[PDB]
Design a protein around this ligand. Structure first.
Ligand SMILES: [Mg+2]
Ligand SMILES: [Mg+2]
Ligand SMILES: [Mg+2]
Ligand SMILES: [Mg+2]
Ligand SMILES: [Mg+2]
Ligand SMILES: [Mg+2]
Ligand SMILES: [Mg+2]
Ligand SMILES: [Mg+2]
Ligand SMILES: [Mg+2]
Ligand SMILES: [Mg+2]
Ligand SMILES: [Mg+2]
Ligand SMILES: [Mg+2]
Ligand SMILES: [Mg+2]
Ligand SMILES: [Mg+2]
Ligand SMILES: [Mg+2]
Ligand SMILES: [Mg+2]
Ligand SMILES: [Mg+2]
Ligand SMILES: [Mg+2]
Ligand SMILES: [Mg+2]
Ligand SMILES: [Mg+2]
Ligand SMILES: [Mg+2]
Ligand SMILES: [Mg+2]
Ligand SMILES: [Mg+2]
Ligand SMILES: [Mg+2]
Ligand SMILES: [Mg+2]
Ligand SMILES: [Mg+2]
Ligand SMILES: [Mg+2]
Ligand SMILES: [Mg+2]
Ligand SMILES: [Mg+2]
Ligand SMILES: [Mg+2]
Ligand SMILES: [Mg+2]
Ligand SMILES: [Mg+2]
Ligand SMILES: [Mg+2]
Ligand SMILES: [Mg+2]
Ligand SMILES: [Mg+2]
Ligand SMILES: [Mg+2]
Ligand SMILES: [Mg+2]
Ligand SMILES: [Mg+2]
Ligand SMILES: [Mg+2]
Ligand SMILES: [Mg+2]
Ligand SMILES: [Mg+2]
Ligand SMILES: [Mg+2]
Ligand SMILES: [Mg+2]
Ligand SMILES: [Mg+2]
Ligand SMILES: [Mg+2]
Ligand SMILES: [Mg+2]
Ligand SMILES: [Mg+2]
Ligand SMILES: [Mg+2]
Ligand SMILES: [Mg+2]
Ligand SMILES: [Mg+2]
Ligand SMILES: [Mg+2]
Ligand SMILES: [Mg+2]
Ligand SMILES: [Mg+2]
Ligand SMILES: [Mg+2]
Ligand SMILES: [Mg+2]
Ligand SMILES: [Mg+2]
Ligand SMILES: [Mg+2]
Ligand SMILES: [Mg+2]
Ligand SMILES: [Mg+2]
Ligand SMILES: [Mg+2]
Ligand SMILES: [Mg+2]
Ligand SMILES: [Mg+2]
Ligand SMILES: [Mg+2]
Ligand SMILES: [Mg+2]
Ligand SMILES: [Mg+2]
Ligand SMILES: [Mg+2]
Ligand SMILES: [Mg+2]
Ligand SMILES: [Mg+2]
Ligand SMILES: [Mg+2]
Ligand SMILES: [Mg+2]
Ligand SMILES: [Mg+2]
Ligand SMILES: [Mg+2]
Ligand SMILES: [Mg+2]
Ligand SMILES: [Mg+2]
Ligand SMILES: [Mg+2]
Ligand SMILES: [Mg+2]
Ligand SMILES: [Mg+2]
Ligand SMILES: [Mg+2]
Ligand SMILES: [Mg+2]
Ligand SMILES: [Mg+2]
Ligand SMILES: [Mg+2]
Ligand SMILES: [Mg+2]
Ligand SMILES: [Mg+2]
Ligand SMILES: [Mg+2]
Ligand SMILES: [Mg+2]
Ligand SMILES: [Mg+2]
Ligand SMILES: [Mg+2]
Ligand SMILES: [Mg+2]
Ligand SMILES: [Mg+2]
Ligand SMILES: [Mg+2]
Ligand SMILES: [Mg+2]
Ligand SMILES: [Mg+2]
Ligand SMILES: [Mg+2]
Ligand SMILES: [Mg+2]
Ligand SMILES: [Mg+2]
Ligand SMILES: [Mg+2]
Ligand SMILES: [Mg+2]
Ligand SMILES: [Mg+2]
Ligand SMILES: [Mg+2]
Ligand SMILES: [Mg+2]
Ligand SMILES: [Mg+2]
Ligand SMILES: [Mg+2]
Ligand SMILES: [Mg+2]
Ligand SMILES: [Mg+2]
Ligand SMILES: [Mg+2]
Ligand SMILES: [Mg+2]
Ligand SMILES: [Mg+2]
Ligand SMILES: [Mg+2]
Ligand SMILES: [Mg+2]
Ligand SMILES: [Mg+2]
Ligand SMILES: [Mg+2]
Ligand SMILES: [Mg+2]
Ligand SMILES: [Mg+2]
Ligand SMILES: [Mg+2]
Ligand SMILES: [Mg+2]
Ligand SMILES: [Mg+2]
Ligand SMILES: [Mg+2]
Ligand SMILES: [Mg+2]
Ligand SMILES: [Mg+2]
Ligand SMILES: [Mg+2]
Ligand SMILES: [Mg+2]
Ligand SMILES: [Mg+2]
Ligand SMILES: [Mg+2]
Ligand SMILES: [Mg+2]
Ligand SMILES: [Mg+2]
Ligand SMILES: [Mg+2]
Ligand SMILES: [Mg+2]
Ligand SMILES: [Mg+2]
Ligand SMILES: [Mg+2]
Ligand SMILES: [Mg+2]
Ligand SMILES: [Mg+2]
Ligand SMILES: [Mg+2]
Ligand SMILES: [Mg+2]
Ligand SMILES: [Mg+2]
Ligand SMILES: [Mg+2]
Ligand SMILES: [Mg+2]
Ligand SMILES: [Mg+2]
Ligand SMILES: [Mg+2]
Ligand SMILES: [Mg+2]
Ligand SMILES: [Mg+2]
Ligand SMILES: [Mg+2]
Ligand SMILES: [Mg+2]
Ligand SMILES: [Mg+2]
Ligand SMILES: [Mg+2]
Ligand SMILES: [Mg+2]
Ligand SMILES: [Mg+2]
Ligand SMILES: [Mg+2]
Ligand SMILES: [Mg+2]
Ligand SMILES: [Mg+2]
Ligand SMILES: [Mg+2]
Ligand SMILES: [Mg+2]
Ligand SMILES: [Mg+2]
Ligand SMILES: [Mg+2]
Ligand SMILES: [Mg+2]
Ligand SMILES: [Mg+2]
Ligand SMILES: [Mg+2]
Ligand SMILES: [Mg+2]
Ligand SMILES: [Mg+2]
Ligand SMILES: [Mg+2]
Ligand SMILES: [Mg+2]
Ligand SMILES: [Mg+2]
Ligand SMILES: [Mg+2]
Ligand SMILES: [Mg+2]
Ligand SMILES: [Mg+2]
Ligand SMILES: [Mg+2]
Ligand SMILES: [Mg+2]
Ligand SMILES: [Mg+2]
Ligand SMILES: [Mg+2]
Ligand SMILES: [Mg+2]
Ligand SMILES: [Mg+2]
Ligand SMILES: [Mg+2]
Ligand SMILES: [Mg+2]
Ligand SMILES: [Mg+2]
Ligand SMILES: [Mg+2]
Ligand SMILES: [Mg+2]
Ligand SMILES: [Mg+2]
Ligand SMILES: [Mg+2]
Ligand SMILES: [Mg+2]
Ligand SMILES: [Mg+2]
Ligand SMILES: [Mg+2]
Ligand SMILES: [Mg+2]
Ligand SMILES: [Mg+2]
Ligand SMILES: [Mg+2]
Ligand SMILES: [Mg+2]
Ligand SMILES: [Zn+2]
Lengths: 204, 131, 118, 122, 59
RNA sequence: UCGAUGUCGGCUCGUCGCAUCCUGGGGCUGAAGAAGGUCCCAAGGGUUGGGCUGUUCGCCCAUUAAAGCGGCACGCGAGCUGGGUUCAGAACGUCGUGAGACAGUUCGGUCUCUAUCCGCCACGGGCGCAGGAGGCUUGAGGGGGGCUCUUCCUAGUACGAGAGGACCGGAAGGGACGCACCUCUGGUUUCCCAGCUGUCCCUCCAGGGGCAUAAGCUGGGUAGCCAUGUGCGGAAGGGAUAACCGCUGAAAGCAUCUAAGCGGGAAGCCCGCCCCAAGAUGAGGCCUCCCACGGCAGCCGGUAAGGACCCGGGAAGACCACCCGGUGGAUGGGCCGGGGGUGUAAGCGCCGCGAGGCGUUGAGCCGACCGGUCCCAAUCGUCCGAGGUCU
RNA sequence: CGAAUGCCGGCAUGAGUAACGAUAAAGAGGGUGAGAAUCCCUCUCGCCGUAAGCCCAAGGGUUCCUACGCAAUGGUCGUCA
RNA sequence: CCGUGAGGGAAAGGUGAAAAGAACCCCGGGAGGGGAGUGAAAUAGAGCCUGAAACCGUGGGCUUACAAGCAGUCACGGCCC
């Protein structure tokens, strides 16, 4: 279940066989294994990867310490790749060949406290024929006296975006080892320069 | 890091430097590759470039022609591998970036608004005289 | 949703804000130091510094630009003659914004001062 | 992007001139019909003594939209008119000719003859 | 709208409880290195017009 | 319930029932095949757009896998509407000597900014999880999602006189819905550029500013936020089952799917997939860090590891919270190069009586986008914060 | 007296909540003063101009001027009225 | 004060025997208070006899952050007097 931590640079498109392929580029490598989870010691299999070197002045003792036991230089970010055990001390996009498939994770853009026509695609009310201050309102949230209550999981206006989103089965279009760049066809969540995980796909 | 460069680096392998320079108001002929049955032919298409949207690699220019009684516009990725070539055929002197108004003008009225661009013409003829 | 937008609104429409920055430029390029609000200042740095920096080029054209926002000529003449010169070797930053500890009584507005740089 | 109410110019020698789309024949609830797709529409303005006539309910494929249509090569295409060619339930054009260009997508989707009778394919 | 209005008076406890967040967080003060008079960080000392070690104001 | 429980239809938003309209799995069939009919299992998902009418309903047009019926005060007016109806006006038909009446028809007719409590959508503060901290995690348990059509191959084969035309298996392309993204297509883009009219002004010309909207009009318009645009998803697979189909098999020498026992078998139940989540007080686990401080399971005081306040800010955001940075520094603002937009500035010179045109010139101006540079400001600091109870 | 949507008065809740009366608009400097976004002066910006400017008449009745004041009225503040 | 008018129609008492009604000093612009002083008494200080209740606040003792409820009653237990 290979995977790699990385940041989102941006997305353009390229040409491949007289065809335009939208791509999003990711600065995946290079991630050093700073710890290996185990079933006996921790009770489960994974690999804690590091990504983005960090200025030691901003790194504190317990962190500095943990980076020691792994003989690992400091770093900015720490995420795990469950059920994954690389044979070596360092992970790189080389683990991905072109034409493969991956599931991508990113902290989606944040739309703030967004409305109901925006978070839940409602249709609100008409813009005429007598609409009285409801042009973007939801409607009715319940029945009457039975049940005489509102449902849980109900759809209402609220914070929307800036939440973890995992996109799946994307296409490895190309990998640029020279720079640790993974090209994946499709849309990847989150803003540019945001963090993303690139885990092997679970689809078939 | 720099996000721009990397992006520019991925594009760097698909950028063209053989296509000629041109402007809205110019008349252009774009030898374009086309697939059909079952081979591939090069279909020319000649019209006033009414719109060069720019973004380095993502620059795309809009060419407009009037084909048999119907007005057709079409979009071309300036760095597409389909374009065999591009021949200039006239330097029009549009006094504007986008020519959205010649969609409603007559073939005549369009001629008054885009009388030739003498300058970018001799300038052309200025070259072309290699050794 | 305000993703990647620079330049506040200061509760003022398209022009009252333009007149504000200007009317703060005039009243700054005149006295060296005024005492406004922390925000009004912050957004007045960039507006001015562009003005002076054109004063540094001093060419005919610039004067006519800067003079749109400032109108007054004597002031502008004070800009290209006196101020602008003491800034030629300086690369940007012609203004300094500092905040005052004591807070306005009427509305507790946070005070800060904007001054021309040495 | 053709939907009900959308008048369409006609590019053949049926006698009809303009038709109001009333249904896209492309699924249970498709929203719009584009180049190469088939629709059912009314005859809202034809010529005298022609094959069709103001009122008939007919089938016809859309050949030319005013909304550009994208392509796998990045390119696009947009015509100044929305046009269709009246056809029969076997996709054959009930006309003997066609007028103006047509979109190279039509061939893809089984309308060989029209593509042949069209003066310029794009 | 139909003029919403409370069905019951709010108990003392129920209001005084809702006010467990009305505590004023006292102002952040620090000493001025040249007059030692307390004042907020990041402001031009109102007691001696000093800031960044240099003079800036009359007081 | 008349010191008021507002009553039809629609819009919006759902959710449940299953006597199932569709998709799925079966038995019988006057089931050859394809396509139908009739009962049984199944409520996961779906169940279009229109014309008439206030209408529910019904009829009709075009479609479809199908265009299901019903409950939630004939769901839903402190959520909207207000066509019907059901105050006062007016009129028609009818009844009444009349005043007036009928619900029969007809045109018109005030629908009330502020949510205390439960409830719901999101977000914090406090505390607690026996030492105190900084990070990374298990996932009990919840939520989300679950749809379907078409065409080619099998094959014009099995079947059938013929028209028509399969099961099983294998590919390809769509529709509606959903999550996210902004390369392309397409919108906005409040002062990024330019053009233009009338008026007042600076400075007479020239060049400019104000106002004409809360941009004066117009033509263009980066970033950002967007969809019509783009990528992706429904699954595969494993397990247990429903209606049905059996293996072996007594009772009951035959027979029987069951009484002992073992199989096959649904879009449905369980897991798998996406998201949340240890307040999971059953408060879990792992890595690193700190320590065994003074005075008298408690108190007071000073530190450690750490954090908080303060500040510069951010596609994070109502405040708060979260994320980055604070001179050991590229966080914001300015300056510089690039991108980008507008599309050839002012000034001078030449042609023209003149409005103008030409060259200097893709020139000048120039917000947000990708980077560099300590010029400007995040100066200087303060306050909390362990001594780890008992068997 | 414990109730009459009772009568007079006092004090609570909703609550530090809506709102603070036209979206024509504000910015800096100097002075004053115990105290200033709110008063005076100065410059810049905006706003009415068949008026939001100038007269007369009804009506109001000392609100006009000046000096000294800010508890109360001013929907904030007030050294202003 | 309400109403054009006939007409309607309030609320509002108390220091002390005697002002002997708080000079003077102190913080403050003032209001207000802190000592001094008067008085038998000053939470009789003029916003004054007595000063209840709602209502508001400060300090203290017990108690509360896995609980559920007409809030109370019975039993027990822990802490405080
Ligand atoms: Mg990237
Ligand atoms: Mg992440
Ligand atoms: Mg946001
Ligand atoms: Mg959404
Ligand atoms: Mg929407
Ligand atoms: Mg709608
Ligand atoms: Mg409507
Ligand atoms: Mg709408
Ligand atoms: Mg209304
Ligand atoms: Mg409205
Ligand atoms: Mg609603
Ligand atoms: Mg209701
Ligand atoms: Mg109930
Ligand atoms: Mg959030
Ligand atoms: Mg490639
Ligand atoms: Mg980029
Ligand atoms: Mg590089
Ligand atoms: Mg032409
Ligand atoms: Mg080629
Ligand atoms: Mg907005
Ligand atoms: Mg920014
Ligand atoms: Mg901003
Ligand atoms: Mg601005
Ligand atoms: Mg701001
Ligand atoms: Mg304005
Ligand atoms: Mg304006
Ligand atoms: Mg700038
Ligand atoms: Mg402050
Ligand atoms: Mg035609
Ligand atoms: Mg007819
Ligand atoms: Mg051809
Ligand atoms: Mg209402
Ligand atoms: Mg209303
Ligand atoms: Mg109530
Ligand atoms: Mg109480
Ligand atoms: Mg209390
Ligand atoms: Mg409360
Ligand atoms: Mg002093
Ligand atoms: Mg009742
Ligand atoms: Mg009743
Ligand atoms: Mg009621
Ligand atoms: Mg009642
Ligand atoms: Mg049944
Ligand atoms: Mg079925
Ligand atoms: Mg079936
Ligand atoms: Mg039969
Ligand atoms: Mg048969
Ligand atoms: Mg059959
Ligand atoms: Mg059957
Ligand atoms: Mg169902
Ligand atoms: Mg259903
Ligand atoms: Mg219908
Ligand atoms: Mg209609
Ligand atoms: Mg009916
Ligand atoms: Mg009938
Ligand atoms: Mg059919
Ligand atoms: Mg069927
Ligand atoms: Mg009923
Ligand atoms: Mg009924
Ligand atoms: Mg009802
Ligand atoms: Mg209702
Ligand atoms: Mg209503
Ligand atoms: Mg209703
Ligand atoms: Mg009505
Ligand atoms: Mg009616
Ligand atoms: Mg009726
Ligand atoms: Mg009625
Ligand atoms: Mg009547
Ligand atoms: Mg009559
Ligand atoms: Mg009659
Ligand atoms: Mg009658
Ligand atoms: Mg009678
Ligand atoms: Mg009668
Ligand atoms: Mg009657
Ligand atoms: Mg009647
Ligand atoms: Mg009317
Ligand atoms: Mg009526
Ligand atoms: Mg209304
Ligand atoms: Mg009311
Ligand atoms: Mg509430
Ligand atoms: Mg309740
Ligand atoms: Mg919490
Ligand atoms: Mg907390
Ligand atoms: Mg952290
Ligand atoms: Mg565990
Ligand atoms: Mg639970
Ligand atoms: Mg679970
Ligand atoms: Mg065959
Ligand atoms: Mg045979
Ligand atoms: Mg199949
Ligand atoms: Mg599909
Ligand atoms: Mg972009
Ligand atoms: Mg775009
Ligand atoms: Mg675009
Ligand atoms: Mg400007
Ligand atoms: Mg003058
Ligand atoms: Mg003049
Ligand atoms: Mg002029
Ligand atoms: Mg003016
Ligand atoms: Mg004006
Ligand atoms: Mg307005
Ligand atoms: Mg303007
Ligand atoms: Mg446009
Ligand atoms: Mg843009
Ligand atoms: Mg769409
Ligand atoms: Mg799909
Ligand atoms: Mg048998
Ligand atoms: Mg047997
Ligand atoms: Mg058995
Ligand atoms: Mg089995
Ligand atoms: Mg079994
Ligand atoms: Mg079997
Ligand atoms: Mg099984
Ligand atoms: Mg399926
Ligand atoms: Mg998580
Ligand atoms: Mg925990
Ligand atoms: Mg439990
Ligand atoms: Mg723990
Ligand atoms: Mg902020
Ligand atoms: Mg920090
Ligand atoms: Mg520091
Ligand atoms: Mg920086
Ligand atoms: Mg910078
Ligand atoms: Mg720049
Ligand atoms: Mg550039
Ligand atoms: Mg450019
Ligand atoms: Mg020129
Ligand atoms: Mg020039
Ligand atoms: Mg001359
Ligand atoms: Mg010439
Ligand atoms: Mg530039
Ligand atoms: Mg450096
Ligand atoms: Mg520095
Ligand atoms: Mg100790
Ligand atoms: Mg009684
Ligand atoms: Mg009442
Ligand atoms: Mg009452
Ligand atoms: Mg009541
Ligand atoms: Mg009373
Ligand atoms: Mg508040
Ligand atoms: Mg509230
Ligand atoms: Mg509120
Ligand atoms: Mg408010
Ligand atoms: Mg205006
Ligand atoms: Mg304002
Ligand atoms: Mg001032
Ligand atoms: Mg002053
Ligand atoms: Mg003031
Ligand atoms: Mg004051
Ligand atoms: Mg004001
Ligand atoms: Mg006039
Ligand atoms: Mg008089
Ligand atoms: Mg009066
Ligand atoms: Mg007077
Ligand atoms: Mg006063
Ligand atoms: Mg006062
Ligand atoms: Mg006052
Ligand atoms: Mg007052
Ligand atoms: Mg006042
Ligand atoms: Mg008032
Ligand atoms: Mg005074
Ligand atoms: Mg005075
Ligand atoms: Mg009266
Ligand atoms: Mg009177
Ligand atoms: Mg009376
Ligand atoms: Mg009296
Ligand atoms: Mg007495
Ligand atoms: Mg005194
Ligand atoms: Mg004093
Ligand atoms: Mg004093
Ligand atoms: Mg006194
Ligand atoms: Mg006293
Ligand atoms: Mg005494
Ligand atoms: Mg005695
Ligand atoms: Mg006594
Ligand atoms: Mg007493
Ligand atoms: Mg007493
Ligand atoms: Mg007495
Ligand atoms: Mg008393
Ligand atoms: Mg008292
Ligand atoms: Mg207490
Ligand atoms: Mg429990
Ligand atoms: Mg407890
Ligand atoms: Mg007991
Ligand atoms: Zn100081």
């Amino acid at each position: 279940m290979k995977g790699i931590l990385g940041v989102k640079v941006g997305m353009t498109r390229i040409f491949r066989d007289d065809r335009a392929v939208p791509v999003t580029v990711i600065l995946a490598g290079p991630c050093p294994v700073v710890q290996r989870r185990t079933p006996e010691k921790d009770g489960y299999t994974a690999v804690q990867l590091g990504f983005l070197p960090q200025n030691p002045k901003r790194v504190n003792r317990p962190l500095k310490g943990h980076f020691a036991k792994a003989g690992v230089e400091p770093v900015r970010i720490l995420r795990e790749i469950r059920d994954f055990n690389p044979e070596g001390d360092t992970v790189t996009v080389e683990i991905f060949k072109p034409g493969e498939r991956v599931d991508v994770t990113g902290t989606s853009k944040g739309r703030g406290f967004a409305g109901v026509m925006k978070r839940w695609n409602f249709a609100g009310g008409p813009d005429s024929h007598g609409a009285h201050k409801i042009h973007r309102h939801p409607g009715s949230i319940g029945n009457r006296k039975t049940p005489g209550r509102v449902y849980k999981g109900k759809k209402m206006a609220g914070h929307y975006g800036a939440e973890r989103v995992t996109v799946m089965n994307l296409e490895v279009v190309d990998v640029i080892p020279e720079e640790n760049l993974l090209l994946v066809k499709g849309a990847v969540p989150g803003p540019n320069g945001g963090l993303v995980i690139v885990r092997e796909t679970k689809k078939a | 890091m720099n996000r721009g460069a990397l992006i520019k680096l991925v594009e760097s392998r698909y950028v063209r430097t053989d296509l000629p320079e041109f402007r809205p108001g110019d008349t252009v002929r774009v030898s374009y590759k086309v697939k059909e049955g079952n081979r591939t032919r090069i279909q020319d298409f000649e019209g006033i470039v009414i719109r060069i949207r720019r973004n380095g690699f993502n620059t795309t220019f809009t060419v407009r022609k009037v084909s048999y009684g119907v007005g057709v516009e079409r979009i071309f990725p300036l760095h597409s591998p389909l374009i065999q070539k591009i021949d200039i055929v006239q330097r029009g002197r549009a006094r504007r970036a986008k020519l959205y108004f010649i969609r409603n003008l007559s073939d005549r009225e369009i001629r008054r608004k885009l009388r030739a661009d003498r300058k970018r013409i001799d300038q052309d003829r200025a070259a072309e005289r290699a050794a | 949703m305000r993703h990647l937008k620079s330049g506040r609104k200061l509760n003022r429409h398209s022009s009252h804000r333009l007149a504000l920055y200007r009317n703060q430029a005039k009243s700054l390029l005149t006295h060296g130091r005024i005492t406004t609000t922390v925000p009004k200042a912050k957004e007045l740095r960039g507006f001015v510094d562009h003005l002076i920096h054109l004063a540094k080029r001093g060419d005919l054209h610039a004067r006519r630009l800067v003079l749109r926002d400032l109108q007054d000529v004597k002031l502008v003449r004070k800009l290209f003659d006196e101020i602008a010169p003491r800034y030629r070797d300086r690369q940007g930053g012609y203004t300094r914004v500092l905040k005052l500890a004591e807070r306005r009584r009427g509305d507790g507005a946070p005070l800060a001062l904007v001054e021309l740089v040495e | 992007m053709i939907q009900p109410q959308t008048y369409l110019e006609v590019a053949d020698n049926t006698g009809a001139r303009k038709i109001m789309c009333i249904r896209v024949l492309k699924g249970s609830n498709a929203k719009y019909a584009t180049v190469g797709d088939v629709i059912v529409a009314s005859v809202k303005e034809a010529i005298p003594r022609g094959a069709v006539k103001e009122g008939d309910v007919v089938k016809a494929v859309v050949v030319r939209t005013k909304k550009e249509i994208k392509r796998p090569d990045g390119s696009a295409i947009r015509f100044d008119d929305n046009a269709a060619v009246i056809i029969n339930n076997q996709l054959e054009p009930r006309g003997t000719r066609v007028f103006g260009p047509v979109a190279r997508e039509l061939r893809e989707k089984g309308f060989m003859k029209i593509v042949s009778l069209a003066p310029e394919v794009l | 709208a139909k003029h919403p209005v409370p069905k019951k008076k709010t108990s003392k406890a129920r209001r005084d409880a809702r006010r467990s967040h009305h505590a004023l967080t006292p102002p952040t003060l620090v000493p001025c290195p040249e007059c030692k008079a307390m004042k907020p960080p990041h402001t031009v000392c109102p007691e001696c017009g000093y800031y960044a070690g240099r003079k800036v104001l009359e007081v």
